[PDB]
Structure formats: C-alpha cells, structure tokens
Amino acid sequence: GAMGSMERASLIQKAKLAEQAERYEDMAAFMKGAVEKGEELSCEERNLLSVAYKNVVGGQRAAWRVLSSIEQKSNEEEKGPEVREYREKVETELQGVCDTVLGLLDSHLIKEAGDAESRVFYLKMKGDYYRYLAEVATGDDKKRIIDSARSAYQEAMDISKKEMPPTNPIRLGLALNFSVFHYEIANSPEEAISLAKTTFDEAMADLHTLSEDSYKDSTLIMQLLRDNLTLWT
C-alpha cells in the first residue's frame, strides 16, 4: 500500500488532521494504512476508521440515490445510455469502498477482536457495509448479501446482550442500525418496530446507573430510536 512507508503513529495523527479539515477520503486512506500495520486498534482508532469510511460511503450513497431517481423517471423522452452509465459508475465506486472495508474486517480485524467493545463494533461495521451493498443490489446476489448483513448483525447482537449493559452506546447504535436493516432492507417493518421499542425501553430502565456524561451519550442515541418509531408508526 502507498501508506506502507509511513509510521503508524503518523498515520493516526494525519487521520485526525484530515477529520478536522473535512478530508474524508484522505482520512480513510490514512486509517486503511494504519489497519494494515497489523496491530489491533484502540477505541479511538476504531472510531477514526468508522468516521472516515462512513463519510466517504455516505457521499456515494447520496449521489447514487439522486442518479437512481433520475434513471427511474427516465424509464416511465429517451436520453440514451448516459444516466445508466453514470449511475453504474458511482455504484461501482461505492461497491469498491464497501469491499475495501469488508476486506479490512476480514483481514484481520474481526479474528483478533476478543473484547466485546471491539468485536461488537467490528461485526456491526460488517453488517453496515453489507447493508450498503444491499441497497444497490439487484442481481442473483441481493439475497446472499442481505443474509450476510443479517448474520453479522445477529452475531453482534448476541454478544452485546450478553456482555454490555442496555445503555452502552455501541449496543444502542447496533440495535438502531439492525432496526433500519429490518425496515429498509429486509421488508420486516414489524421486526424493526419491535426491536426499536424493546431497545429504547430497556435502555430507559438502565439510565439510573449512569453518570451525567454517560447519560447524555446514551440518551442522544435513544432519541434516534424514538424518531424512527415516530416515522414508522
């Protein structure tokens, strides 16, 4: 990799600078280089990795949705192959980013992650990037991509329920994203609603155990569960 000659600590430092400068493609390249050094990642480093790729793929997803909408309207005056071609170009670049993230998780972040906070984080990430692949999938692969997302989310859920309190922000973010998977991807709106409700209620009952700062962290994510429940019901 082009980052192979840079020190691990310098890559992490530059990822933090790239975040401040809103240079998320650079941030992702620096964090990919850091992962490829072969050492495990601290909590802060895992979050730098997630921030970088979430911003990159988020821009791609937003662009894909704009182009997909234009393409669908055109298929209800014939304008030639250009809309399809350009939607495909963006789609292929999005798939490539998802494949890069999944490859880092498989080589070798997940297999070395033994603590709940790291293992759940990475398995959630695996579910998320298969979910982004599912959003654009149509061929003989959508079903297998959906099942890969489901399997990663389910393993993360099983660990999170055994090893983390119901207010833990990683556990809450996982449940939130799995509920979105159910509603948007898996055609299971009832499962989505049930998961969001149970997650919210069990977190509410555990807030009394938390410090002022942890209370703020957990309630911020609980509000997203509530907002989705308002949209879905």
Partner: peptide, 8 residues
C-alpha cells in the same frame, strides 16, 4: 428514510 447511527 429511517435514521441510522450517527458519528460520535
């Protein structure tokens, strides 16, 4: 669209 987890 449904809201997913935000960056921290």
């Amino acid at each position: 669209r449904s809201l997913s987890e935000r960056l921290m």
